[PDB]
Amino acid sequence: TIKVAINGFGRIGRLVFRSLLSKANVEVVAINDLTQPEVLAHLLKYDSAHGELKRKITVKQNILQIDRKKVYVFSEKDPQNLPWDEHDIDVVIESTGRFVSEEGASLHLKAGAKRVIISAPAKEKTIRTVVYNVNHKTISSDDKIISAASCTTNCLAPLVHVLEKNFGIVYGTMLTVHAYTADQRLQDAPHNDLRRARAAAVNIVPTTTGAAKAIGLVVPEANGKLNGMSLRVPVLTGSIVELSVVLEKSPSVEQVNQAMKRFASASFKYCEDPIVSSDVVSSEYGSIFDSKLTNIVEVDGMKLYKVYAWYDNESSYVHQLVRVVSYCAKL
Amino acid sequence: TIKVAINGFGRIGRLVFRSLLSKANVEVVAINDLTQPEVLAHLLKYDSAHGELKRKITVKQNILQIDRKKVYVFSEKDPQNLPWDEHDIDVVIESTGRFVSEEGASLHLKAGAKRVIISAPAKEKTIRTVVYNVNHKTISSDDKIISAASCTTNCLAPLVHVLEKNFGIVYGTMLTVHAYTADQRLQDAPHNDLRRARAAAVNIVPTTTGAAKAIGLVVPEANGKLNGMSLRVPVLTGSIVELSVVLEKSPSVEQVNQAMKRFASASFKYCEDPIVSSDVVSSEYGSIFDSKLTNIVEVDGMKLYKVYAWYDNESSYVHQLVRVVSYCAKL
Numbered sequence: 001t002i003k004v005a006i007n008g009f010g011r012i013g014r015l016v017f018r019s020l021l022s023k024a025n026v027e028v029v030a031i032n033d034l035t036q037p038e039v040l041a042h043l044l045k046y047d048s049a050h051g052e053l054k055r056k057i058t059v060k061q062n063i064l065q066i067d068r069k070k071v072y073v074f075s076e077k078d079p080q081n082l083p084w085d086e087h088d089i090d091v092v093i094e095s096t097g098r099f100v101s102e103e104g105a106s107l108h109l110k111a112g113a114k115r116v117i118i119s120a121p122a123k124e125k126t127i128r129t130v131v132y133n134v135n136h137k138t139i140s141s142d143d144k145i146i147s148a149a150s151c152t153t154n155c156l157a158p159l160v161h162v163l164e165k166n167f168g169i170v171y172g173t174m175l176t177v178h179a180y181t182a183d184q185r186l187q188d189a190p191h192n193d194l195r196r197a198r199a200a201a202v203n204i205v206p207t208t209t210g211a212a213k214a215i216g217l218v219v220p221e222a223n224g225k226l227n228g229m230s231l232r233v234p235v236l237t238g239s240i241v242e243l244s245v246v247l248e249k250s251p252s253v254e255q256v257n258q259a260m261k262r263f264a265s266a267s268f269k270y271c272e273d274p275i276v277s278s279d280v281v282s283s284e285y286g287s288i289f290d291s292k293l294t295n296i297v298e299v300d301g302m303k304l305y306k307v308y309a310w311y312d313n314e315s316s317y318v319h320q321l322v323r324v325v326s327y328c329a330k331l
Numbered sequence: 332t333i334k335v336a337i338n339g340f341g342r343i344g345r346l347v348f349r350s351l352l353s354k355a356n357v358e359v360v361a362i363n364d365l366t367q368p369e370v371l372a373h374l375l376k377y378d379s380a381h382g383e384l385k386r387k388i389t390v391k392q393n394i395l396q397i398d399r400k401k402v403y404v405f406s407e408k409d410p411q412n413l414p415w416d417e418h419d420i421d422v423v424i425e426s427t428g429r430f431v432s433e434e435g436a437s438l439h440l441k442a443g444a445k446r447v448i449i450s451a452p453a454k455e456k457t458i459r460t461v462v463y464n465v466n467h468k469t470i471s472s473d474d475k476i477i478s479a480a481s482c483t484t485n486c487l488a489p490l491v492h493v494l495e496k497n498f499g500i501v502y503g504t505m506l507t508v509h510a511y512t513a514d515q516r517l518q519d520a521p522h523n524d525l526r527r528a529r530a531a532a533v534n535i536v537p538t539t540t541g542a543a544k545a546i547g548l549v550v551p552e553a554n555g556k557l558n559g560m561s562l563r564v565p566v567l568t569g570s571i572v573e574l575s576v577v578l579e580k581s582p583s584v585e586q587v588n589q590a591m592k593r594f595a596s597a598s599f600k601y602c603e604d605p606i607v608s609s610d611v612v613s614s615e616y617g618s619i620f621d622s623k624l625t626n627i628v629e630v631d632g633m634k635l636y637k638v639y640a641w642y643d644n645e646s647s648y649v650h651q652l653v654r655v656v657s658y659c660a661k662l
């Protein structure tokens with residue numbers, strides 16, 4: 001039974017908190033953000049995309065109570081000042097978006113936490129990076145910092161895994177059409193990415209995706225074969241990946257779809273219905289394969305394979321991260 | 332001077348009407364739709380995406396008056412009942428979306444107009460289909476029915492033309508992330524396309540694109556080389572195309588961008604700024620090339636070229652269609 005602190009009680013941190021309430025072997029004993037406890041308790045209870053948390057939620061001083069559970073609430077901008085040794089923290093979930101480097105995440109280790117899971121790709125290629133049910137068994141008990149990759153990586157990685165194991169990828173491209181996130185702007189405002197600066201709910205916004213630099217770390221044999229980008233669009237949550245690849249073998253559409261069905265798990269859903277993004281909101285699958293969209297572009301004997309998967313960039317990622325935390329409990 | 336009628340006074344029909352007010356060799360003398368003239372006058376005056384038309388607009392009986400100009404208004408669901416012979420119509424702009432077949436559009440010929448331009452791909456592959464400043468000089472006097480293709484085709488066609496003439500296309504794929512249109516549903520409602528049935532302003536919606544069948548007709552050497560689809564997303568108007576292709580020659584990114592810039596015209600904008608979809612609302616360019624996004628996926632000597640162009644699926648297409656109309660006025 002491991003003790004967890006959540007650094008950054010935001011969209012990802014709060015949903016991870018919600019999900020950990022039902023995991024028996026994991027207790028969140030502390031959270032940290034930049035505001036009063038009452039604000040966090042209110043944002044924990046009411047969630048624009050994922051509905052109300054139907055538990056009695058109280059605040060007394062810096063103590064968040066959820067029915068009978070007591071959670072210490074801190075407001076410390078410098079994680080090295082967090083009292084992780086005093087609270088015997090086993091794992092910090094680092095979900096501020098502000099400590100994704102090895103040095104940044106290790107400030108929690110200096111504070112006394114035994115292990116850090118970054119809710120994003122790490123800055124360095126040397127950090128252990130996992131997608132649950134693709135390569136999480138590569139985690140070592142010696143890994144002090146672990147990256148759970150990005151939302152798009154968790155969507156993309158099962159597809160790449162299946163194509164690589166079954167057919168062999170030569171090269172390809174990916175594109176995610178992706179819900180806007182808190183890194184964008186409600187009204188046109190300063191941002192170093194001059195397109196993420198732009199009013200997010202009325203704009204198609206081209207930008208980077210973390211899946212580009214993380215996919216080769218999760219499926220090593222696909223390293224260097226894919227690139228792509230993100231078009232952020234005005235939906236609150238919910239996203240889709242289009243992957244177009246040249247394969248070594250030449251399967252039929254039916255064989256590609258069957259290869260995906262066989263990899264179905266708690267992390268990978270085989271969908272057969274003509275759905276749209278809102279149908280995956282709050283999903284617990286890290287990836288939802290859209291088998292009706294699979295098609296081949298065939299020109300003079302050349303074949304370009306196109307496959308699609310959905311993901312709730314919040315919930316899908318959150319339950320993957322939660323699966324990683326539970327696995328670390330057994331370590 | 333040619334006399335024009337507009338059949339279908341919708342998003343496209345009204346913006347075409349607006350633009351034709353500034354073209355002196357083209358007089359719109361009649362319009363047709365399914366409502367009272369007062370309704371049409373108001374929708375012509377006030378436009379949610381493109382702002383107010385600042386003229387005096389009056390209705391007296393079935394006559395729409397704009398300053399000094401008088402326009403007859405009709406409400407005939409069956410185009411063969413329209414009085415095109417009496418009003419000496421040279422060109423009908425068929426923009427209802429309900430007469431895109433050769434037999435459907437030809438009802439305007441039976442009614443007495445000399446020539447019909449469909450504001451969409453035609454049902455038949457044999458109909459003359461044009462993108463202005465790509466292949467509009469292929470129009471002949473035998474072409475009584477002409478298709479101005481689709482909005483995505485008008486954006487994509489100059490890129491396919493430039494790549495094909497300079498470098499040769501082997502095969503590739505296109506994806507358009509596309510504003511919602513009147514063919515989608517505001518609330519989940521019946522539609523033969525079960526994804527276009529879904530609430531359009533809260534969903535990413537995978538669907539067909541008319542550019543998949545129209546591109547081979549406009550750039551003949553590229554026929555059969557491309558396929559792709561559309562993701563409708565919640566923006567009122569404004570769209571982008573990503574084109575990923577294998578090329579015979581191996582140009583640099585700079586040489587690809589330079590080839591695009593050489594082909595610039597009133598139909599094709601060379602853009603160097605980091606824009607988003609709202610910056611192309613009301614554009615008169617058929618296609619807006621995003622030079623900053625051009626990149627190459629290079630894997631052990633294999634190259635995948637990726638290029639991007641924006642378009643206001645309304646105004647960009649509208650101004651392309653008006654250029655076809657002006658050209659038809661000369662021949």
Ligand SMILES: NC(=O)c1ccc[n+]([C@@H]2O[C@H](COP(=O)([O-])OP(=O)(O)OC[C@H]3O[C@@H](n4cnc5c(N)ncnc54)[C@H](O)[C@@H]3O)[C@@H](O)[C@H]2O)c1
Pocket residue numbers: 007008009010011012013032033034076077078095096097098119120150151181182183313314317
């Ligand atoms: N939103 C998604 O779809 C998504 C998906 C996967 C991964 N992620 C990643 O998860 C991380 C968080 O994303 P998010 O959407 O939750 O963002 P967010 O803005 O909702 O959450 C970040 C939270 O951290 C707090 N914070 C900021 N600086 C802090 C500091 N110095 N100390 C303590 N708290 C601090 C903020 O107040 C905020 O509540 C990012 O790395 C992001 O890339 C996000």
Ligand SMILES: NC(=O)c1ccc[n+]([C@@H]2O[C@H](COP(=O)([O-])OP(=O)(O)OC[C@H]3O[C@@H](n4cnc5c(N)ncnc54)[C@H](O)[C@@H]3O)[C@@H](O)[C@H]2O)c1
Pocket residue numbers: 338339340341342343344363364365407408409426427428429450451481482512513514644645648
């Ligand atoms: N909206 C775009 O982005 C876009 C872009 C390029 C081409 N187009 C094409 O242009 C056409 C029109 O599209 P739109 O967006 O203007 O749609 P719309 O719904 O705004 O316009 C269609 C109009 O035709 C009228 N109408 C319907 N049936 C009629 C009939 N039998 N007789 C007379 N009037 C009738 C409707 O009342 C409406 O005003 C379609 O073929 C569409 O594919 C649309």
